């Protein structure tokens, strides 16, 4: 047999990300006293376009409070942020658009984007373009708050997690129909190498498990167990229900 395309994608020979023109890691600033127990002031110097994502990155320039000099940062742009803005990122910050707040201060129903998953990891949840997570409730007994992730699942987080208020910019990106092959090929300029995707049933029996015979077809159910060996795990993995939803 052979090693199918999903088995060669794990080594990373030609499938590494084309992250050469990328601006940098977009995240909050490191946790400290001036943010835990006070507020800082950040200036949104300019909005930039980090290649390989549909959400613009804003270049916020703080001041070093402990030392002398600037503390340049890189924030994902919430919608509505403009050049020359003043955004305050602290625990006592005011509930405006772009002001980073601990998730435990936002009133129920507040919109928070770029929420942390654990206090101090600087942004995990709701980072893509046009997405946001909505606070649900609070629980002062154990200092945990419920939010609704953009997938609809609801997760419980500590109240110290930071979460910039608002929705992420560049929303409604996918509503435009890519019309051609070229436009879809240029979309993967700053991503991995996976665009022209050849069907399993249009393959010889070695390359893919779906390699058909004298008629182009599958032959065995595509719904597989989760505990299949890598290489035979094709089609739909652990499918609870297949077919069009009626």
């Amino acid at each position: 047999g052979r090693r199918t395309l999903s088995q060669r994608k794990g080594r990373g020979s030609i499938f590494k990300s084309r992250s050469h023109h990328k601006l940098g890691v977009a995240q909050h600033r490191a946790i400290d006293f001036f943010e835990r127990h006070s507020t800082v002031r950040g200036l949104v110097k300019s909005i930039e376009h980090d290649p390989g994502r549909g959400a613009p990155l804003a270049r916020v320039v703080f001041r070093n409070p402990r030392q002398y000099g600037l503390d340049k940062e890189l924030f994902i742009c919430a919608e509505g942020l403009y050049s020359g803005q003043y955004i305050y990122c602290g625990s006592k910050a005011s509930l405006h658009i772009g002001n980073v707040l601990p998730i435990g201060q936002c009133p129920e129903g507040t919109v928070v984007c770029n929420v942390e998953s654990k206090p101090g990891d600087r942004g995990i949840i709701a980072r893509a373009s046009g997405n946001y997570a909505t606070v649900i409730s609070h629980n002062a007994d154990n200092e945990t708050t419920r939010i609704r992730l953009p997938s609809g699942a609801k997760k419980t987080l500590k109240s110290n997690c930071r979460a910039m208020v608002g929705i992420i910019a560049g929303g409604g990106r996918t509503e435009k129909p890519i019309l051609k092959a070229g436009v879809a090929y240029r979309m993967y300029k700053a991503k991995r190498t996976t665009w022209p995707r050849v069907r399993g049933v249009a393959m010889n029996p070695v390359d893919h498990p779906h390699g058909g015979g004298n008629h182009q077809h599958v032959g065995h159910p595509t719904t597989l167990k989760r505990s299949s060996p890598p290489g035979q795990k094709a089609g739909k993995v652990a499918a609870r229900r297949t077919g069009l939803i009626r």
Partner: protein, 90 residues
């Protein structure tokens, strides 16, 4: 010069009736000057996917990928505004 296929007449005859009508709505918005919230002018012109630069008075406003402010991104501005004021007073 053309009865109904206004901007998508550059695609000729080779993408389908529905898709060329769907993309007509988006390419129109993508290439129009919006009223600039600060300088108060029809000068905001898109530069990248989600970065609108007011050419009138030199500001870079973020927004939707094809419109200056998405519908779901304007209620959140009002939703936060409603939640902020009530929180202040009781």
């Amino acid at each position: 010069r053309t009865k109904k296929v206004g901007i998508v007449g550059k695609y000729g005859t080779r993408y389908g009736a529905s898709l060329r009508k769907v993309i007509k709505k988006i390419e129109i918005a993508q290439h129009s000057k919006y009223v600039c919230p600060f300088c108060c002018k029809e000068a905001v012109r898109r530069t990248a996917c989600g970065i609108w630069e007011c050419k009138g008075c030199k500001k870079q406003i973020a927004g939707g990928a094809y419109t200056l402010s998405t519908i779901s991104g304007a209620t959140v501005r009002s939703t936060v505004r409603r939640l902020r004021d009530a929180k202040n007073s009781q």
